[PDB]
Design a protein around this ligand. Sequence first.
Ligand SMILES: C[C@@H]1NC(=O)N[C@@H]1CCCCCC(=O)O
Ligand SMILES: [Ca+2]
Length: 595
Amino acid sequence: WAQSRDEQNLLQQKRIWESPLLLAAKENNVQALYKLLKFEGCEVHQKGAMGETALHIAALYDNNEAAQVLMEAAPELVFEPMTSELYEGQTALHIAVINQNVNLVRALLARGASVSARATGSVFHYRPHNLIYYGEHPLSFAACVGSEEIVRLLIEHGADIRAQDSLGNTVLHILILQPNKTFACQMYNLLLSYDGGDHLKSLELVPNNQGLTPFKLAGVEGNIVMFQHLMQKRKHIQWTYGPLTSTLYDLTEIDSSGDDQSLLELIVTTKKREARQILDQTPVKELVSLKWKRYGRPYFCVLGAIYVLYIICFTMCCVYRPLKPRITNRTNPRDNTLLQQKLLQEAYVTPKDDLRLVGELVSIVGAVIILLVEIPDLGGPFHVIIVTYAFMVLVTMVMRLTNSDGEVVPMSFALVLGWCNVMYFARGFQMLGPFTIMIQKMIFGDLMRFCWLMAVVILGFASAFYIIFQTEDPDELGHFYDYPMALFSTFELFLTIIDGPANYDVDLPFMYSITYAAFAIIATLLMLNLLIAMMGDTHWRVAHERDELWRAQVVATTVMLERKLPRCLWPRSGICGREYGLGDRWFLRVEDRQD
Ligand SMILES: C[C@@H]1NC(=O)N[C@@H]1CCCCCC(=O)O
Ligand SMILES: [Ca+2]
């Protein structure tokens, strides 16, 4: 697709060269325009490759003199849009506004150029392959280029500030997506000066297509300067006492009032890393910290202690499995067999089997409660593991009443997944909070690397060892008696967790010694190169990323507890302004001291 516009831009230059009229508009050749327009009559309404006219070209390459000749000879060219799909709807005013040719913009508005002309072409879409997004209407173009002179000039000729684009963005929504945050604030206020001024139907209230007010969209995008600027409109200073200043905050669009209306709801769910810095701002960080000091952290430990006991209950039923002898003399055929099956679905006969029964009941009513609170739909795996555990418990009860060969298989998965999910609660316990994020974040980046290389390394060394020792006999060495043991023993050899094959009475093959020396070296190199390469995440910037991602996890977990738990506990944050002076809204008291 990108080659098409590359072809079309190259094609347009060819059509500009071929057409002697369009070339004069590109090169500002006033002398040639008069000879073509007047003496040797040429098609003045000439359409170019991009469906453009000579006036579109005269505005692209800032040539006011050539543009004025075309308008004095054919003033209807001003209203003509670009017919091409890439530039559907663009007019010569859009081009003159974005190039800040005020004299051409002034002269174009004299011809009555439509200020409501929408530029709906594909190069004007809010897409990553487009380098800018200024909206559709010419007023938003002037707002994004920072030309305040053209902005008021377009308003004077009847520009509507409430104009929404394809994505329902008002001119305020578009300014927040612009890079220059420090200069767009002054431009932002200039547009609000032409607002209706009434307390209702303010332009700051018109939401996005995704249901986002300009204030709320600024927080999601991570725009700090606009979020700070928009905050002045909703904070009220109570009094000034020396260095102390007590400020009251409106807290309306920030708190979790509506189901999805909450701004905090949007900050924890969005993918932008810059949005993490919004909960550090001075309306939010005081709020989210008060929600964690009281009603947040204490309930998390309560739910933590409950889940830990529930796992101990399930763990106790797994250590006290049904017990039974082997009931078969199968142990001698394939004499390596070591099993003593213990499965028997006795009716009751319970001196203490009823004790583990209610534990199997707690585990069932627990796994079904777990499965009925998460499936009715950062903390990713630690919430996908619990449902996998609850799945295993229900499958284990289906392994019961069927008592298949692998009774331990789905039950063993529930033990590791049940305990390794207890360190989910690490996110709210100070010391190991960021630590769990550390072990969680590398499982993707620094684990898949060196794992695909460890796996590929053993498939060369493990397969060698089997060749060296299927000629020998499994009786004395036996580390590589079949192929699966060759892979599994060498894997353990890679981590040095087993002792390394060594038999000094017998004589080992002369190929084992050379291969293992190379294995012992390579296994240490890739092991040391896992350590020092995984060490790069120790920059003092990561010192924030270790911590400020843990604070983000605490804030994200704080939002989780308040949504599901009833309103009887965890009252609404702040103080309701009703029964005070500020009508039925909730406010937060924050006082500071400036040095
Ligand atoms: C230069 C082209 N010639 C023309 O007459 N209009 C085009 C303007 C190019 C703007 C592309 C904006 C974008 O990347 O979306
Ligand atoms: Ca050892």
